[PDB]
Design a protein around this ligand. Sequence first.
Ligand SMILES: NCCCN(CC[C@H](N)C(=O)O)C[C@H]1O[C@@H](n2cnc3c(N)ncnc32)[C@H](O)[C@@H]1O
Ligand SMILES: NCCCN(CC[C@H](N)C(=O)O)C[C@H]1O[C@@H](n2cnc3c(N)ncnc32)[C@H](O)[C@@H]1O
Ligand SMILES: NCCCN(CC[C@H](N)C(=O)O)C[C@H]1O[C@@H](n2cnc3c(N)ncnc32)[C@H](O)[C@@H]1O
Ligand SMILES: NCCCN(CC[C@H](N)C(=O)O)C[C@H]1O[C@@H](n2cnc3c(N)ncnc32)[C@H](O)[C@@H]1O
Lengths: 343, 343, 343, 343
Amino acid sequence: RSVFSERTEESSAVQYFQFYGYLSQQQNMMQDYVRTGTYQRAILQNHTDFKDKIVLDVGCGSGILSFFAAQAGARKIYAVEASTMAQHAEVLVKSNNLTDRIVVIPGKVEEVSLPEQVDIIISEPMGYMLFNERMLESYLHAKKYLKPSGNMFPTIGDVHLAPFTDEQLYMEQFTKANFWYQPSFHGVDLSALRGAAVDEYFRQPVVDTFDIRILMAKSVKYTVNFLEAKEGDLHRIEIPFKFHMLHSGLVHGLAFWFDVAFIGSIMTVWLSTAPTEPLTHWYQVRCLFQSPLFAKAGDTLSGTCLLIANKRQSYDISIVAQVDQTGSKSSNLLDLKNPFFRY
Amino acid sequence: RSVFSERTEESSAVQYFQFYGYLSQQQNMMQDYVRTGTYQRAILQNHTDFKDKIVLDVGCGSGILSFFAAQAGARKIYAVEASTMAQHAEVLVKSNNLTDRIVVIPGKVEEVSLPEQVDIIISEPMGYMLFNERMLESYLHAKKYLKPSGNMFPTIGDVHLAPFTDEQLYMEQFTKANFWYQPSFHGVDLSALRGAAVDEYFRQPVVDTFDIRILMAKSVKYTVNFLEAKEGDLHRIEIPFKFHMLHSGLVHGLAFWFDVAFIGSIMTVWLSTAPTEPLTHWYQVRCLFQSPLFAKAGDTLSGTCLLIANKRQSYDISIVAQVDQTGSKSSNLLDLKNPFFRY
Amino acid sequence: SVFSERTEESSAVQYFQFYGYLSQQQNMMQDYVRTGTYQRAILQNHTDFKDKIVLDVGCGSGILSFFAAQAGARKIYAVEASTMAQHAEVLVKSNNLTDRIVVIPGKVEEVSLPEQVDIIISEPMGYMLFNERMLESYLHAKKYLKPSGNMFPTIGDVHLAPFTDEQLYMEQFTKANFWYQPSFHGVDLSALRGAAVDEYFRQPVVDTFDIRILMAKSVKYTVNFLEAKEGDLHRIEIPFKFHMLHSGLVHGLAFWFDVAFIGSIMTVWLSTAPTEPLTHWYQVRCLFQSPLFAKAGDTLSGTCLLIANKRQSYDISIVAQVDQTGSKSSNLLDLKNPFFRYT
Amino acid sequence: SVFSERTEESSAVQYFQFYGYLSQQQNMMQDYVRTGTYQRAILQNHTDFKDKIVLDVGCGSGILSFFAAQAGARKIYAVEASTMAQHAEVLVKSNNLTDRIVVIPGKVEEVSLPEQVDIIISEPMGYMLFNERMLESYLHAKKYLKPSGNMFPTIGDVHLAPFTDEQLYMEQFTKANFWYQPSFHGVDLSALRGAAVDEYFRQPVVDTFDIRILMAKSVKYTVNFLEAKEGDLHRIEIPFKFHMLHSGLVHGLAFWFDVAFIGSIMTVWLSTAPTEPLTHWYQVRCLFQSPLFAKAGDTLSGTCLLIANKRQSYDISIVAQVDQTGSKSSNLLDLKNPFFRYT
Ligand SMILES: NCCCN(CC[C@H](N)C(=O)O)C[C@H]1O[C@@H](n2cnc3c(N)ncnc32)[C@H](O)[C@@H]1O
Ligand SMILES: NCCCN(CC[C@H](N)C(=O)O)C[C@H]1O[C@@H](n2cnc3c(N)ncnc32)[C@H](O)[C@@H]1O
Ligand SMILES: NCCCN(CC[C@H](N)C(=O)O)C[C@H]1O[C@@H](n2cnc3c(N)ncnc32)[C@H](O)[C@@H]1O
Ligand SMILES: NCCCN(CC[C@H](N)C(=O)O)C[C@H]1O[C@@H](n2cnc3c(N)ncnc32)[C@H](O)[C@@H]1O
């Protein structure tokens, strides 16, 4: 009867936590130097926000963030982890002689019991498009243990949206669906499913990186303040947008990336996944329109990106975009849980 | 009234003979050095087939072929031309002091009267894919003026067929038809016409040249013997084919070209539009399948190319192809009258 | 009918066969300036359409009728003579507008319409505005227009300006000089050179150009579609007197056109001028047979006489003289068969 | 049901969600070797299908049922448990086969069939043949097979062979040695290097390889689907005795499989051997924890024990020893989490 079990299908949760039980996946994340190094810089440069403080690390995995908090002088760190990785974290705590300061609490943060309130919560809950995996809600849920005067690292999150043009990517996905147009595949007529196939392929967010010159307008920003937001705020996320087109051409979809800010007492440290910044394991995310929209420089592209949380720990993405001057409209549905990894 | 008028719509004939009434189009054909030079070599190298003979030039245009026949020693050349170019040809006959050997007969070869039977017929009746413009029927119809043992230049014509792979051409035509998939073009849903647009764009034979490495099998040859053929034989041309695939991959359609041979007493001279040979104003022609067929090397691709002559001086092309081992079948109907010039 | 009495059947067949292709409708719909300006003119004057009866002359795909429906018209009669009428009816059904738009297949001069309309919409402009002679169908349709009705477009302005283009003028002789050789494969072609030159100079040149070739502000000839009669377009006499801004040789006259939608809220302009973004009409240039030298400050006076023919086009007669010098030149062009020079 | 009692719910959900994607069906259909061989086997044994009753276990898109229909089958019951069943029904309708193919949505262990069948067709092979445990569904379905009924495929051969691949072996420690560093961002990771090594070696390597890495003739283990029962697949003991053709270090065992369609007219083989063209099954290699040195002429004897688990896969235990030296090696592998190494 936990909020996690009430919002998550068991099949999804089992697969999710088996995935994060593998050391190879921990290694993959740790070897993202931009992520790991920016987190260490955020915590150590703001060491006075940790010195002799009580810390909660939500989803500690291998424990790396808890060790950073220990390096910064934290009095006690409660490292919560639901996967079997919790046992490997304990091994590292002992072999690094930090048993007196890092306490691994196995289980889900929505289901464990902590012995005290904490001064600061640290976590790495960002997925693709920031919101995938629905771990932000576990991060916000954990604020029940946070002191009124407490802080959170990261403190805020910016989602950036921008229209792009990429005929090669659009053609690439259409070529895959063209298989289901065949009138005689080994003598079988498949064309009747051509519609279902296009929908399925264009339902896939494309995870990869791209040249910034494909972006056709200054990005739009949607900000989530983790200190202020509540869990329920992430069940439905409505992001309006109005782009002033800087170039003429076809808009094949919207590109997404995110920044998070660790707003400490000493300085604010940013971790960015923008295409102008060094690449991370989050790359960037692009959602294609089933049909591209034409716009000239000076036109306006308006609409809404609506994310609806589902019980598979992801979101159903509804994107409606409209060229204001012409009424040229594009509606699209995307399944954020199952992206197409193009890199 | 005449054989020509019964098989031809008046509007098509008006446009057709207006077209060839332009000196700029005659210049275009004369500056095809491969064509003009090969005809001259075929006629002069076989000067004995013209020396002191009576000649009929069907569709003399500017009269260039008649001048070649005169150079080869013909006693009398009847040059029949239906467009207003006939008056320009008469100007050239006079300025070249050949009034005693070249007699221009204004009118259609199916309607004019000649004083005598001729020893040899010369003409350039080949269009795109050999048969476009239906001038071969006029060429064969002129045999009513040919002596029993007379000759014809060209004597035979070979149509070559071969499967090709060209995903860029296929996607290019699909991209153009994709326009009619839009659900909101300026607020208007065009998708209901997607089927009709694809059918229209893929009805166009693609006229241009290509690298021979796109061909996936040795070509199949269909021979027309102009000495034996009857004009009626060209109303319905059924070309069966069986290719033995040399390469594995997608077959996007069939490529067409043609060779004509001048079989003379001294030597046989070939005029080829094959992609291995220097380019001509005929280029090559490719008929796309609406959906490509997969075949592995060693498979056989069988079917029929059916050409039905229409009243617009062209052909309706039906291509049915099948991979024998798998039953994968592809069909297409093409309108040879209105091709896509891609060069 | 009025149409059949002014049009040769062969021209009509070719004309409506041409517009029966979705690819030709698409070519015009993809002209963003044209389609976007029409939409802006109709929607920004929504009060001229809301709850009113509309006639769309030559609706083609129906796009303009859909814009009129977007503006709130109660009933739109969409008349189309080509087989595009069947595709238009499909779009009316698939956009759920059978209660508002009625497609009427046939020529506007021949069909029966039940009632008078409040506003007529159409896009009847060709090259130089008048080519295709469709404006006469537009004006003929006013027999269905209420005394207080409106016309969209309301007026049309054709612009004339002198130009200098040494390359364009010399190109005609470079092409015609192909005929000025004494032994083209042993044939003396020189007797036809003059005929070749005349043929090239009779072709208006369709393409665009740098505005810096223009030697004077254009002269404007205005057709008020609300007051004009279709008989006013059979003979169009455009007298001109250019005040030369630059000194040099005038090689001919350049043509473009504007149309204006004069609505209750605002006037919207569609321009094909070389100072504006290119459209599928490009611009048209007609050469003088001999260049005229004109000093800055001189006056270039003359007449451009457009005489309608039964090929749905015009014979163009241009006479020009330099007033200060008396230097005179003329030309007579066939607009039905222009030279497409654009690359 | 029998399925629900051998399968954890979470695994089954993920399993049938995976196969509900048209892109996954397409991936299998585009394996020409697989799809073409199945068609050959069915069509070349038309006498085993003509006017027969057929059961297709896990029809997916229905491709195999359409092959059975092409062979003249009287009635085909196509059973599919994922949402792909709804797409197969759409194809049966669009191919006008509703009189012959009855799609039954559900698990073959749970649905009810209206009659007994003459032959069962299916493609139940996973990696290493047995992965996914779908063969048990194939055998379970024999409760509907008549006493003289047939099975397509009829038998399955698993081939085991020792290999040497120094690079593959070394790659494991290169990856695991990430953890053997004393200050990863100030953290000593070395205590987990052993666990990381164990995790990597527990992964069967899926890719292809040069046949020259094989050190002996393969050993074969045959499953006769006509005679076998579901229970026979829960514990699979494969003893082996290899006679080393080459001297060197044996780093593990390579796996591949064949199936044979034993029909009345001919037997057709589908092979995934490394000597045959590649399929989407590739081959599988299981490394030994410690390599074994063997001289040409020595004997490598041991056992490969496959124990089914409720994640629809197998726990693999391999024990091998060089008979002439007594040098011994083991390994435990989890076939559910393979390393896809192919590039
Ligand atoms: N691409 C996003 C990486 C998130 N990843 C952080 C890894 C750790 N910060 C590191 O770098 O070492 C999630 C980790 O947090 C765990 N996790 C999830 N959700 C709950 C939850 N509700 N309760 C407890 N742990 C969770 C998850 O198992 C897993 O290990
Ligand atoms: N690929 C074919 C085009 C070649 N074109 C010039 C050939 C000439 N030998 C040259 O090289 O200049 C044909 C010419 O033949 C004429 N032509 C057609 N059909 C009848 C016909 N039925 N009767 C008389 N002339 C014809 C046609 O007008 C036209 O000028
Ligand atoms: N550049 C010229 C306009 C092309 N085209 C506009 C199509 C549509 N309105 C749009 O703007 O998208 C004209 C269309 O009108 C038709 N047309 C002609 N003349 C008669 C006529 N006399 N009667 C009926 N229709 C006509 C013609 O076939 C044709 O499709
Ligand atoms: N070794 C690869 C199997 C691929 N695939 C065959 C598809 C189709 N026959 C083809 O050849 O293209 C399995 C398919 O069988 C289904 N399937 C599984 N197990 C049950 C089961 N127990 N009951 C019903 N269907 C099943 C599965 O969902 C899935 O679509």
